[PDB]
Design a protein around this ligand. Structure first.
Ligand code: P1A
Lengths: 224, 234
């Protein structure tokens, strides 16, 4: 079972859209909170989103932890890349806070900036990628049956295939005029994987308060 | 499908067959020693791979559309697809029976073989890819189209990217058409599954680079040709 509604919803419940506050590069112990806030919201929305995706919570606890840990970066990059379509020349975070080429170091990112903008943002922009498409792609990213340590392999493979069908169907009816639309959407995934590979650590995990291992932060977020 | 697409696919399958394996001469010219049984399996693997990359360039050079690109973009695409396209070549020589790869000399190479050669670090993931591909029952046409699709991918430092993308579109259209015709139980799903391979190839390709750098830790030298084409020195 894969309801296209359930998917559009999950991406909506997290649909961020508030100001357009450029980040302040100063130790005014305030930016530290604007960044910290953007982080907390971004990561909460990550797990909040995953739980709203059809049958995700029906997976073994250990498996939903592994899936998020693995897809973490790709999922986030996809998220902030899509809502960065409005920004003229910058990346838009959850706080509504935005980053730029110069104000990129803090908030991780930095050397994925140029590439994120040129291969994702601009591409999504000139393609008019909508939240439903994004929702499907991110869900596809999430249900990676090849992630290691996963138990419900076949279960995940099937859930992913269903999302392919949903997105395949959604595009044929929304753009009967653009046959390549489906493929054009899926071809954003390799670019996304490449950019993610350039990361080396889970994005924004250190702007988080106190210490707590990744698997634990996730384990409790998936229960809260 | 369409009378023109079948032509394109006929052509691709042909080129694929034309450059599948290397020359009898080039192969024999390899196994001719000096050092122990370890540095040997390593020399075979690396030397044969050189031929493999050469074959890939031969195939790419003849793909409709390639000649319409700027020399600089051609070099860029070829450099970038080498490590990726070779995973296909590898998967096509995978034997399910022995969980191994049948090299040119029919000598099947396994985890142990690569391990002995000093490349046990990535062999698992490599074999895993071979199984994944196998389970999808990918045929010659699909492999050929997919290879073309991989070759005409958006890559960094591309001059006429848009020109590459338009070329890729033609092959993507061919693939879809081919898949709709022969594949019915969710053609569109198989189509997406095949494209998902491209994204996995970014990972395998990245692993190949990681392993090359790791050869420096050990005291293994990567043949110049390979080290160069893959810029394994940066
Ligand atoms: C660092 C670099 C050398 C590593 C490359 C390794 O990871 C790979 C990808 O695992 C290499 C090792 C040897 C290999 O080049 C081959 C041997 C053959 O005999 C044949 C030559 C030619 O008919 C190819 O169409 C298929 C095959 C199986 C190639 C494919 C890729 C392989 C299997």
């Amino acid at each position: 079972d894969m309801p296209l509604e359930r998917i559009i919803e999950a991406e909506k419940r997290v649909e961020c859209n508030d100001p357009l506050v450029a980040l302040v590069v100063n130790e005014n112990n305030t930016t530290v909170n604007n960044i910290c806030q953007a982080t907390h919201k971004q990561l909460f929305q990550l797990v909040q989103w995953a739980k709203l995706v059809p049958h995700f919570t029906s997976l073994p606890l250990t498996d939903q932890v592994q899936l998020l840990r693995a897809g973490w970066n790709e999922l986030l990059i996809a998220a902030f890349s899509h809502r960065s379509m409005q920004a003229q020349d910058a990346i838009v975070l959850a706080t509504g806070l935005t980053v730029n080429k110069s104000t990129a170091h803090a908030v991780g990112v930095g050397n994925i900036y140029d590439r994120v903008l040129s291969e994702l943002v601009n591409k999504m922009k000139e393609m008019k990628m909508d939240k439903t498409e994004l929702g499907c792609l991110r869900a596809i990213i999430l249900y990676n049956p090849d992630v290691r340590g996963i138990k419900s392999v076949q279960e995940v493979e099937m859930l992913r295939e269903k999302i392919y069908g949903v997105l395949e169907e959604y595009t044929r009816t929304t753009h009967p005029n653009e046959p390549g639309r489906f493929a054009k959407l899926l071809l954003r995934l390799p670019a996304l994987r490449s950019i993610g590979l350039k990361c080396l650590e889970h994005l924004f995990f250190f702007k988080l308060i106190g210490d707590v291992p990744i698997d634990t932060f996730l384990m409790e977020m998936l229960e809260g | 499908i369409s009378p023109e697409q079948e032509e394109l696919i006929h052509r691709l399958v042909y080129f694929q067959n034309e450059y599948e394996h290397p020359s009898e001469e080039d192969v024999k010219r390899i196994i001719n020693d000096g050092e122990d049984q370890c540095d040997v399996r390593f020399r075979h693997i690396t030397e044969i791979t050189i031929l493999t990359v050469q074959l890939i360039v031969e195939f790419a050079k003849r793909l409709p559309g390639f000649d319409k690109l700027l020399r600089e973009d051609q070099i860029a695409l070829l450099k970038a697809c080498s490590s990726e396209v070779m995973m296909f070549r590898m998967a096509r020589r995978y034997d399910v029976q022995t969980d191994s790869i049948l090299f040119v000399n029919n000598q099947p190479y396994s985890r142990d073989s690569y391990n002995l050669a000093g490349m046990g670090e990535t062999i698992e993931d490599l074999l895993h890819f071979c199984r994944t591909m196998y389970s999808m029952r990918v045929d010659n046409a699909e492999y050929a189209l997919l290879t073309a699709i991989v070759i005409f991918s958006e890559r960094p430092a591309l001059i006429e990217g848009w020109k590459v993308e338009k070329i890729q579109e033609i092959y993507l259209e061919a693939l879809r058409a081919y898949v709709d015709n022969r594949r019915k139980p969710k053609p569109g799903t198989i189509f997406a599954k095949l494209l998902s391979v491209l994204t996995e190839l970014r990972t395998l390709g990245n692993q190949n680079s990681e392993m090359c750098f790791s050869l420096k830790l050990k005291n293994k030298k990567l043949p110049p040709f390979l080290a160069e084409i893959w810029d394994v020195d940066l």
